[PDB]
Amino acid sequence: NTLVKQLSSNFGAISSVLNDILSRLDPPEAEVQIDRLITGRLQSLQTYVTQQLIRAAEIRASANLAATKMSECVLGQSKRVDFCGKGYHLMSFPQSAPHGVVFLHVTYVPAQEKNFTTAPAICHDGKAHFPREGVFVSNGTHWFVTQRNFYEPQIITTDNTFVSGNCDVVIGIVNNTVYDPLQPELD
Amino acid sequence: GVNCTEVNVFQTRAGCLIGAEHVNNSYECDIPIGAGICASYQTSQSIIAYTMSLGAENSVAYSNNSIAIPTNFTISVTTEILPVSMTKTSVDCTMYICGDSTECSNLLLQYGSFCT
Amino acid sequence: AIPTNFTISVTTEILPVSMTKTSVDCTMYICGDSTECSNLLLQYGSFCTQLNRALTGIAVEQDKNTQEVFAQVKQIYKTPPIKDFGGFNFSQILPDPSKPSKRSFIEDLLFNKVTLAQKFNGLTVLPPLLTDEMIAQYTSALLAGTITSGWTFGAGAALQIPFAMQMAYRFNGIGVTQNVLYENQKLIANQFNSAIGKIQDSLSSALGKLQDVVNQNAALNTLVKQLSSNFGAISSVLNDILSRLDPPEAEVQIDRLITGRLQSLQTYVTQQLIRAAEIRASANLAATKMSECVLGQSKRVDFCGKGYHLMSFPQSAPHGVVFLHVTYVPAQEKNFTTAPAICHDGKAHFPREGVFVSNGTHWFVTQRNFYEPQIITTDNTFVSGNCDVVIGIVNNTVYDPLQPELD
Ligand SMILES: *[C@@H]1O[C@H](CO[C@@H]2O[C@@H](C)[C@@H](O)[C@@H](O)[C@@H]2O)[C@@H](O[C@@H]2O[C@H](CO)[C@@H](O)[C@H](O)[C@H]2NC(C)=O)[C@H](O)[C@H]1NC(C)=O
Ligand SMILES: *[C@@H]1O[C@H](CO)[C@@H](O[C@@H]2O[C@H](CO)[C@@H](O)[C@H](O)[C@H]2NC(C)=O)[C@H](O)[C@H]1NC(C)=O
Ligand SMILES: *[C@@H]1O[C@H](CO)[C@@H](O[C@@H]2O[C@H](CO)[C@@H](O)[C@H](O)[C@H]2NC(C)=O)[C@H](O)[C@H]1NC(C)=O
Ligand SMILES: *[C@@H]1O[C@H](CO)[C@@H](O[C@@H]2O[C@H](CO)[C@@H](O)[C@H](O)[C@H]2NC(C)=O)[C@H](O)[C@H]1NC(C)=O
Ligand SMILES: *[C@@H]1O[C@H](CO)[C@@H](O[C@@H]2O[C@H](CO)[C@@H](O)[C@H](O)[C@H]2NC(C)=O)[C@H](O)[C@H]1NC(C)=O
Ligand SMILES: *[C@@H]1O[C@H](CO)[C@@H](O[C@@H]2O[C@H](CO)[C@@H](O)[C@H](O)[C@H]2NC(C)=O)[C@H](O)[C@H]1NC(C)=O
Ligand SMILES: *[C@@H]1O[C@H](CO)[C@@H](O)[C@H](O)[C@H]1NC(C)=O
Ligand SMILES: *[C@@H]1O[C@H](CO)[C@@H](O)[C@H](O)[C@H]1NC(C)=O
Ligand SMILES: *[C@@H]1O[C@H](CO)[C@@H](O)[C@H](O)[C@H]1NC(C)=O
Ligand SMILES: *[C@@H]1O[C@H](CO)[C@@H](O)[C@H](O)[C@H]1NC(C)=O
Ligand SMILES: *[C@@H]1O[C@H](CO)[C@@H](O)[C@H](O)[C@H]1NC(C)=O
Ligand SMILES: *[C@@H]1O[C@H](CO)[C@@H](O)[C@H](O)[C@H]1NC(C)=O
């Protein structure tokens, strides 16, 4: 719209339209006004072209980002935090749009919590067991082992822990028992 | 860029605001006036100019032997919108600069190679 | 070759985020208090609205950049009065209430470094939206959340956890087991404190990244000095050219001045769009780095620091952001003699998640990023086929700890 509206300014000539210039006046005395008009219109074209180039560069950067998001969120599962949505990522679906793309991001997200008391090791008989891929939680009397993203408690045994060292160097430790289920079945 | 000595005058850090009551509360930003202040219409009604609030404020009972475990999950669906392309418009330089004339074209030919 | 010791190492990284806003009048700069100039300028059409529109767009984009970079949280957390973090000393990064503002020792030690007439020609500067105290509060809230929750606050609610167990999770995320941390916690705490002290010393005696922005935005001097040029006229003062001539002969002089000053404004505005685009790209990179290094644990090699990644802490330099990556590098190595498979009775025994090293005579299985030899039991490996296809294999025996109990 601005590029069009630039076509009605004198820029210094006696009129803003070329046909009037060439009809009312003799060309050897009209070349100067024609030069003025040509200079003005060239300036307008240069301005428009430069700004369009900058806009195109920005749009290209955005399109590259959109292509990367399509390649990683949709055709696979991502772990880049807060890339494909907000929270843990399950999958995404693409949807077209006029001159754009719209993504739908199904995302796992945790809810209602429950306080607990923890400890990093268990001195059974001088040794010190450690959880394999869990965390030691106690409701207040008995100690359990659960995964770190969902409360599911199981009885602590010797198939959830692996010994390492002795229970005199770990800063926090608590005495407890370990089931060792082989012994009852041995009888 | 003036002081309120010159021409409901709540002197800001960003200038001289005229026509807005100054309240003591803290809400979210509707009109980003600048330098912290943000004006809004929700106060029978009059425009107010309050100070920003960064959000809520809470703490966690962090302790050396306390942990919190989630017990129930939920599933959410969000959206994000990204432009990809725009219109492909070309402009003929001669038809715009000149018209249907010929002397205009002959004079434009002196400027070398701009249209190309 | 396997390491036998490790050393924590803290390094920084400086990124610019935004640049000074600027709105430039395109009528006071050209004409001034005159009116003949204001009438002559009207012929050029809409050449005094597009420049203003572009400059306001740039300013809005700067506000957008800062908001995207720093506003990653909704709740504003607070460090507890309890200061029991298992050995680490976070008393050079957390805010100090004694100072007038809430900038910590590193933050104001950094603000001391960078040093941040023109107006009467029509050149005006605008104030930022988020005042510096708000930025400091954002950084402090991010620090408190990271310290007291690790990453869970970046994906929903905030879940409390002891810091030592959080570092255990961090080590377990890069391959090394957790007993490795739980055995020598004091050494790691001391190394962390020493690294933080060394960084504090280093920053107290560079910041070229944040200084190039200022030395390029202060353009303004060239724009100002493009006023004492005749541009082909007889004198570069409108109040003089209209006090020594008459309209028919003053119009050409005024027109030449108009053309020159319009070219100068066009060049300035053109440069301050390319600079803005570069700054926006840098701000986007900084936002990504915040969201991935700070609110999680990165796996991309050499993204957050150099080495393996544990955690990071943000800061706030003037017109930028500063990270402190906490890396992990192994130190002391030893030669060994490995072998992919150990077949006992015609049954190859590949290791589960370790490696089959030997100290010359015996054979022990150990993990990769550290050294802790063990015995080749049955639960430590798994059988696969018979040993006649594996290229390099040495013949040995396993322990099978089920035997002693059944006697
Ligand atoms: C979880 O955190 C604290 C502590 O609760 C205890 O945590 C263990 C030590 C164990 O003994 C648990 O069985 C206990 O439940 C509490 O936080 C309180 O939250 C209320 C919310 O209204 C607040 O008014 C109190 O000031 C908080 N107390 C402290 C000391 O900060 C509460 O039990 C749990 N908090 C939440 C938010 O669920
Ligand atoms: C904490 O957990 C322990 C271990 O489960 C609970 O003790 C038993 O729990 C089972 C169900 O899990 C009940 O059927 C038993 O009656 C419980 N035994 C006793 C002696 O109480 C215990 O109840 C839980 N709660 C507390 C407060 O300790
Ligand atoms: C967690 O910290 C508390 C202190 O906040 C420990 O409780 C004891 O607190 C008294 C306070 O005077 C100290 O003198 C004791 O030294 C603390 N006990 C110990 C063992 O240091 C509590 O024991 C701590 N828990 C763990 C697992 O370290
Ligand atoms: C987890 O949350 C869901 C949804 O809030 C719970 O499902 C509801 O449970 C209540 C009570 O049993 C029912 O009346 C509703 O019909 C259930 N569905 C919905 C959509 O509300 C579910 O019980 C929760 N699980 C746990 C373990 O708390
Ligand atoms: C691993 O390296 C650390 C240093 O990064 C060693 O820690 C030093 O240990 C000696 C005595 O063993 C002390 O005198 C020093 O004060 C410790 N710190 C430093 C910075 O030197 C540690 O001993 C090394 N571990 C092994 C097994 O060699
Ligand atoms: C490789 O490590 C084993 C570890 O068991 C070494 O075995 C020791 O050998 C000495 C030789 O007299 C015995 O006294 C020890 O009882 C053995 N066990 C331990 C734990 O020391 C073996 O010597 C090492 N090989 C080499 C070449 O150093
Ligand atoms: C565990 O038992 C030992 C003795 O068997 C005792 O010295 C210690 O105080 C107990 N409690 C711990 C280690 O927390
Ligand atoms: C602006 O006006 C206020 C109120 O009179 C005065 O306190 C302040 O000093 C003034 N500032 C300047 C720069 O004149
Ligand atoms: C509002 O704040 C001002 C400045 O602190 C104070 O003078 C005034 O009493 C406050 N009014 C109310 C109603 O809190
Ligand atoms: C942390 O370091 C400062 C400065 O050396 C010291 O004053 C303070 O006591 C230290 N805090 C702890 C817990 O070591
Ligand atoms: C391993 O042996 C090579 C060859 O002699 C030697 O250069 C290298 O230093 C040895 N590695 C160690 C850790 O001693
Ligand atoms: C492979 O194991 C057999 C046992 O059946 C043994 O005789 C042979 O020496 C072993 N191979 C080598 C190279 O020692």
Numbering used by the authors:
A (entry chain A): 960 to 1146
B (entry chain A): 614 to 620, 641 to 676, 689 to 761
C (entry chain B): 713 to 828, 852 to 940, 944 to 956, 958 to 1146
Publication text:
Strikingly, the structures we solved show that the G614 spike exists predominantly in the open, receptor-binding-competent conformation, in contrast to the D614 spike; 87% of G614 spikes have either one or two erect RBDs, compared with 17% in our D614 structure [and less than 50% in the structures of D614 reported elsewhere, none of which showed two erect RBDs]. With a glycine residue at position 614 a salt bridge cannot be formed and thus the structures of the G614 spike in the open and closed conformation are very similar to each other in this region and, importantly, similar to the open conformation of the D614 spike. As a consequence of the D614G substitution, a tightly closed structure observed for the D614 spike is not formed and the G614 spike assembly adopts a greater range of more open and flexible conformations than its D614 counterpart. We conclude that the D614G substitution promotes “opening” of the spike, priming it for binding to the receptor ACE2 and possibly for its subsequent role in membrane fusion.
The spike glycoproteins of coronaviruses are responsible for receptor binding and membrane fusion during the initial stages of virus infection. In this study we present high-resolution, single-particle cryo-electron microscopy structures of the G614 spike variant showing that it adopts a predominantly open conformation, unlike the D614 spike that is mostly closed.
